[PDB]
A and B are shown apart, each in its own frame.
Chain A
Amino acid sequence: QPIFLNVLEAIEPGVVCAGHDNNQPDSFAALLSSLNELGERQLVHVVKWAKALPGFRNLHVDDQMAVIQYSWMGLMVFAMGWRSFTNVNSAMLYFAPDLVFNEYRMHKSRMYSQCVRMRHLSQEFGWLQITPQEFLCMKALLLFSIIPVDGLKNQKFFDELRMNYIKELDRIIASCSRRFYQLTKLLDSVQPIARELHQFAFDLLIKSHMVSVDFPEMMAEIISVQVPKILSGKVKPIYFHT
């Protein structure tokens, strides 16, 4: 109905493949190389998607970049959670059509804890009967859920925008009041997962030269420059609940 929902549908990215060799047996390096490549590819799509979001151009440019860089892992996790829900009912993790994790890959990548958390996130889509329209509006608000402790270059514009995305999530929800509690809670839970993924990726970047994992240039850069701001506590997420 709203103009709003039309937009999110219209701009929602399409299928992104990882380019993985599914004929080669699994190794840590191969799996982790194909996730890194996938990361880069999905980053490109998140950037394009973000810039077409309504009111996004209102932000100062450096806020535009910052916000995407900080929130990217979360958004990925979230959409990946859904992709897994819709495509295979959360029995496995649908990173991409050519990169679907089963438990064995969960263990081999050495991200079993983090993957486990994400499968549970996928299950929540099912348990809560999340609709495609709640998913899209939730995802758009994720982009506005993580900011530097010392705020942005133009905090006001950000706050306005975030406020209006909350409102719009409220419109498409509607004792229904309790729906909001749940979704806000489900949104809150994305952050600790992205944080665990941030640490893993960081640590991995740091040993990459020595485990034969290849990092695309834009990854290495984000993971080394922006991510450590999150892990050091300069950049914190916005939680609905305490």
Chain B
Amino acid sequence: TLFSQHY
């Protein structure tokens, strides 16, 4: 995801 791809 775009949240877990930057975390």
Contact = CB atoms under 8 A, between A and B. Distances in A.
Contacts of B2: 217-218, 221
A225 B1 CA distance: 10
A69 interface: yes
Interface residues of B, number: 6
A64 B1 CA distance: 14
Q: Is the interface of A mostly helix, strand, loop or mixed?
A: helix
* Interface magnitude class on chain A: under 10
A47 B5 CA distance: 13
Contacts of A217: 2
Interface string B1-7: 1111011
A205 to B, nearest CB: 14
Contacts of A47: 7
Contacts of A238: none
Contacts of B4: 65
Contacts of B3: 65, 69, 218, 221-222
A154 to B, nearest CB: 17
A241 to B, nearest CB: 31
Nearest to A226: B3
A75 to B, nearest CB: 15
15 contacts: A47-B7, A64-B7, A65-B3, A65-B4, A65-B7, A69-B3, A217-B2, A218-B2, A218-B3, A218-B6, A221-B1, A221-B2, A221-B3, A222-B3, A225-B1
Interface of B: 1-4, 6-7
